[PDB]
Design a protein around this ligand. Structure first.
Ligand SMILES: C[C@H](NC(=O)CN1Cc2ccc(Cl)cc2[C@H](C(=O)Nc2cncc3ccccc23)C1)c1ccc([N+](=O)[O-])cc1
Ligand SMILES: C[C@H](NC(=O)CN1Cc2ccc(Cl)cc2[C@H](C(=O)Nc2cncc3ccccc23)C1)c1ccc([N+](=O)[O-])cc1
Ligand SMILES: [Cl-]
Lengths: 306, 305
């Protein structure tokens, strides 16, 4: 029993974190096999950030301008290239701690663990979600650039995020491991702002199914709804539209608890109208949206507490 | 910017987790040097759990009755002994991944990271606090016994908790690594219940400082209180008493934000009496009590391990 915001064990990623330095700038890199991946803005000064010409900045660098430190050992850079917004530094040593891995690009609503790092050293691990507006609500201080987001499946690490920047509202933006940004963001200090954020409806439904599995049913009602009427109400509370894909994805949780997806949608409509009236759901007074259907199935018991 | 419930990096502990099997029972063990530590109830059937005599159950076991698996390698048990509610299995191989460590017993209100494990394989890491009633609000399924809690100080892992059981309300109970329970619990299938819990006042104040540091000030007010008047109000809401030690501990956060501890107490008093009025603090509609003053300073300063 219980339900916590749980991260994957970070050990497999901790053995890949290194420090990358270019001139006065120091940030984190991810060392996998003989390549170190890091944000390309490591080659910029603060002045370069308004309108950096990364190609022009990079051509002026040699391999020996990049200092890569793995623990207390200096790695030798033998090649460099830029791919989108990521710099790939070929090094003369393959990481002996390289786990079984993959690079995956995720969609909004997906969750992942973040290993916050500073100077190539891990400080903490936390769980978060790719918001519908393509930002993440992280906890990142200066020096955290290059920290990565990941999921683990059977000893295989799927890297999905690399941290690049903090936006004016305090939220965070980054790229996949091929250097493509999530969202309409760019690695320059120009006027950029996150779009209006919304609640991840399919995740709130998954978390209501988690509450039922753990024994709580107070929020259920005798009603059902059509998918269209649910969306018309949900959109008024700044909730993302619920698609037939989301309904299909909730199928297993619906079968385990005996509560139809549209019947759980009716419960959500009522919670949005009434609030919680002093009650909590899984120890929260707000509707939680950073647990996916897959996270709920992974964490919860396969036996509902009837 | 940002403020998350953050756990310590778990790598140093992951390299210590093993699977321990005795008959039909499988649970997790912690392998440090040449000893594997695990709950002593691994030697109980289920009928034995009703009224176990652990010495009588243990004397009937040989070293070969304990199957210890580290990854895909079987470890050889060469000795066994019991210390309080923990079984210590001496093995023929020292763990090459043994980190610098200590066994420490924590006090209620202190936080730690839990590495949830099943079959000697880590599944997740989360942060929690030892409640004033000595339980932890964990997330554990069958097979999680032997999972451990820890903190990291510089390069040293301080192990503080080993999971033993789930209570009827869904909360959890366990021991320190010397096998002493936190709370009035016993490792037996008998009627046991968590006592009435209280809120950790010093931690709520620390989290209010974290909110101020991160730009939320709506709850600040022009008022102050005495420590005595604050405690009279706090006891009325099932909050733990605030001591001069707690006030001293919050000193640095008070100096950084310019909000005296008793000034923050006046803000907390008004929140208890009036609620949040539709507002949130750090994305929460409840007053969070599972961040200590040190956790707040650490997260707001970027300490690494
Ligand atoms: C908007 C402003 N950015 C800058 O002053 C300098 N940054 C420009 C910039 C542009 C583009 C790209 Cl790709 C990277 C970067 C760098 C950046 O965002 N780095 C960081 C990343 N993550 C977390 C940070 C936390 C504190 C400081 C830097 C962080 C550097 C700012 C204002 C206030 C705060 N705050 O935490 O209160 C953070 C940031
Ligand atoms: C109370 C009841 N316990 C038992 O059925 C058998 N347990 C007796 C027992 C006694 C004493 C000691 Cl020291 C240990 C133990 C074992 C135990 O508590 N193990 C566990 C530990 N943590 C988390 C568990 C989660 C599900 C099942 C076991 C867990 C075994 C129970 C009923 C339902 C649930 N549930 O969440 O659905 C949890 C627990
Ligand atoms: Cl995805």
């Amino acid at each position: 029993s219980g339900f916590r915001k749980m991260a994957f064990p970070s050990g497999k990623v901790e053995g890949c974190m290194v420090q990358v330095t270019c001139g006065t700038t120091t940030l984190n890199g991810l060392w996998l096999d003989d390549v170190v991946y890091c944000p390309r803005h490591v080659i910029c000064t603060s002045e370069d950030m308004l309108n950096p010409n990364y190609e022009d900045l990079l051509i002026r660098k040699s391999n020996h301008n990049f200092l890569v430190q793995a623990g207390n050992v200096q790695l030798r850079v033998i090649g460099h290239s830029m791919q989108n917004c990521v710099l790939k530094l070929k090094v003369d040593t393959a990481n002996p701690k390289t786990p079984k891995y993959k690079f995956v690009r995720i969609q909004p609503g997906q969750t992942f663990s973040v290993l916050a790092c500073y100077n190539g050293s891990p400080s903490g691990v936390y769980q978060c979600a790719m918001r519908p507006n393509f930002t993440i609500k992280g906890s990142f201080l200066n020096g955290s650039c290059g920290s990565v987001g990941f999921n683990i499946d059977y000893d295989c690490v799927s890297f999905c995020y690399m941290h690049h920047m903090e936006l004016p509202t305090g939220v965070h933006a980054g790229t996949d491991l091929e250097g493509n940004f999530y969202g309409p963001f760019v690695d320059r200090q120009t006027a950029q702002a996150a779009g209006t954020d919304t609640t991840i409806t399919v995740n709130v439904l998954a978390w209501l199914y988690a509450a039922v599995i753990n024994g709580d049913r107070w929020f259920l009602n005798r009603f059902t709804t059509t998918l269209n009427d649910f969306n018309l109400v949900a959109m008024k509370y700044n909730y993302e539209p619920l698609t037939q894909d989301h309904v299909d994805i909730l199928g297993p949780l619906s079968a385990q608890t005996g509560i139809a997806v549209l019947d759980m949608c009716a419960s959500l409509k009522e919670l949005l109208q009434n609030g919680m009236n002093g009650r909590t759901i899984l120890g929260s007074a707000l509707l939680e949206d950073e647990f996916t259907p897959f996270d709920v199935v992974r964490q919860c018991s396969g036996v509902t507490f009837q």
